[PDB]
């Protein structure tokens, strides 16, 4: 509801001292507002975001230097990362606005679900573009003033830059901790493209009982390891798991109702690392915090595919 920091005006005059003072102070008011929001929702669930001055200053600089932004969000969960106060924040100059949001990494959605997603992306009147980087569309092509390329990391937003120009301007990584200190691109010299650093937006749901271990948290640096384990367990059923991996895991050894069918990942990580041979220091046990990393970095790549439905609670959109 209230998730963005807001910089009202520049006023063009002078005095960089108070131009820095009013921006620092202004930024701090947003932090106090967020703490008040935190008392409200139980006591525990905090939205994922950042609250330092400089990387928000680097967006506060570029929003009016572009005066139009375009978005790069992933197609496997595009409902959550459409932050409410960013299409509302390209509104405040009373000029050409309405950002025309784009969703990328959309190769993974087939014909029976791209149209079902376009139904949601049209019906509630949200700006939308489908691209594997108004109803008459299947997917736009690589053929089809400053542009603000805005995206939270590991969405392939630096692989989008290596697919429209061929210049190799910014450095992508596997971990999402690289993009910072923006780099503008000159191409088709009457038009300019600017860059934005990696800015995750505050989303008020699913933060500690989360689903956000797909694009946000460090997979190589985690210390809960059972949340994403059961998250990988409950979707992508056992037959597709053994189809991809080839390993024999289970035929319901424990017959009690704690597991039943669709097995949880305390007999999955041990069944993966008993085949990969990863053992502990002292006893021969398959270490689940070693198997969990190779499960998570294989799932979030796109090998173990999963996409949620359009935001109505459905049964199953993917069919393996």
């Amino acid at each position: 509801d209230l998730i963005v920091p807001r910089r009202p005006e520049w006023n063009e005059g002078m005095s960089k001292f108070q131009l820095d003072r009013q921006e620092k102070e202004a930024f701090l008011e947003w932090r106090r507002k967020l703490a008040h929001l935190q008392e409200s929702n139980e006591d525990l669930l905090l939205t994922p975001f950042e609250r330092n001055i400089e990387v928000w200053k680097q967006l506060w600089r570029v929003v009016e230097r572009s005066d139009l932004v375009v978005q790069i969000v992933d197609a496997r969960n595009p409902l959550l990362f459409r932050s409410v106060d960013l299409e509302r924040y390209v509104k405040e100059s009373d000029d050409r606005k309405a950002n025309l949001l784009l969703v990328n990494k959309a190769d993974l959605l087939t014909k029976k679900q791209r149209i079902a997603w376009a139904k949601y992306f049209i019906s509630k009147n949200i700006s939308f573009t489908f691209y594997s980087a108004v109803m008459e569309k299947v997917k736009i092509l690589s053929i089809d003033i400053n542009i603000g390329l805005v995206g939270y990391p590991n969405v392939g937003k630096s692989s989008t830059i290596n697919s429209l120009v061929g210049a190799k301007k910014v450095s992508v990584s596997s971990t999402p901790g690289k993009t910072k200190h923006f780099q503008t691109i000159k191409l088709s010299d009457s038009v300019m493209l600017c860059d934005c650093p990696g800015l995750v937006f505050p989303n008020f749901a699913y933060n500690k009982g989360e689903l956000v271990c797909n694009g946000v948290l460090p997979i190589d640096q985690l210390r809960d390891y059972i949340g994403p384990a059961g998250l990988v367990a409950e979707r992508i059923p056992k037959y597709y798991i053994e189809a991809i991996y080839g390993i024999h895991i289970q035929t319901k050894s424990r017959d009690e109702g704690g597991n039943g069918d669709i097995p949880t990942a305390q007999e999955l990580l041990v069944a993966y690392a008993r085949a990969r041979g990863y053992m502990t220091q002292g006893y021969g046990s398959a270490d689940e915090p070693r198997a969990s990393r190779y499960i998570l970095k294989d799932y979030v790549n796109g090998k173990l595919l999963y996409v949620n439905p359009p935001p109505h609670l459905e049964d199953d959109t993917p069919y393996t």
Binding site: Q266, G282, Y283, S285, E288
Partner: protein, 136 residues
């Protein structure tokens, strides 16, 4: 040594030193216990400490129910395989070494001890006597 123990035990032959992985006898969810130390053990240079029947040890779960492992917890040795002498003359030994997870007061964590339990262990703790079906 007297950490919730009832009385004083005779010197049973020291069956299993530190590093011994004995079985787990109760239904706590553990399956084996890795002995790291024995409570009330004397210090001699190079003599690594050993646990007899009925001793309270500090141990670590090495297999089963991941709520239980990666932490140090007290156990009580209820079966040993080293043959020891009872003062009424009989020598005896079990077929496996096996212990039971307890709190520092001596109260158990499980609810039933599968398999036999030595008399010298069942007598020294009134909670191991309450949860054991077969005694010797």
């Amino acid at each position: 040594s007297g950490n919730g123990a009832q009385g004083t035990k005779f010197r049973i032959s020291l069956g299993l030193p530190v590093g011994a992985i004995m079985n787990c006898a109760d239904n706590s969810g553990a399956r084996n216990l890795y002995i790291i130390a024995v409570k009330g053990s004397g210090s001699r240079l190079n003599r690594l400490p050993a646990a007899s029947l009925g001793d309270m040890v500090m141990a670590t779960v090495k297999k089963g129910k991941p709520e239980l492992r990666k932490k140090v917890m007290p156990a009580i040795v209820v079966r040993q395989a080293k043959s020891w002498r009872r003062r009424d003359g009989v020598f005896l030994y079990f077929e496996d070494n096996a212990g039971v997870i307890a709190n520092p007061k001596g109260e158990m964590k499980g609810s039933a001890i599968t398999g036999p339990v030595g008399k010298e262990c069942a007598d020294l703790w009134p909670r191991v006597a309450s949860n054991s079906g077969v005694v010797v």
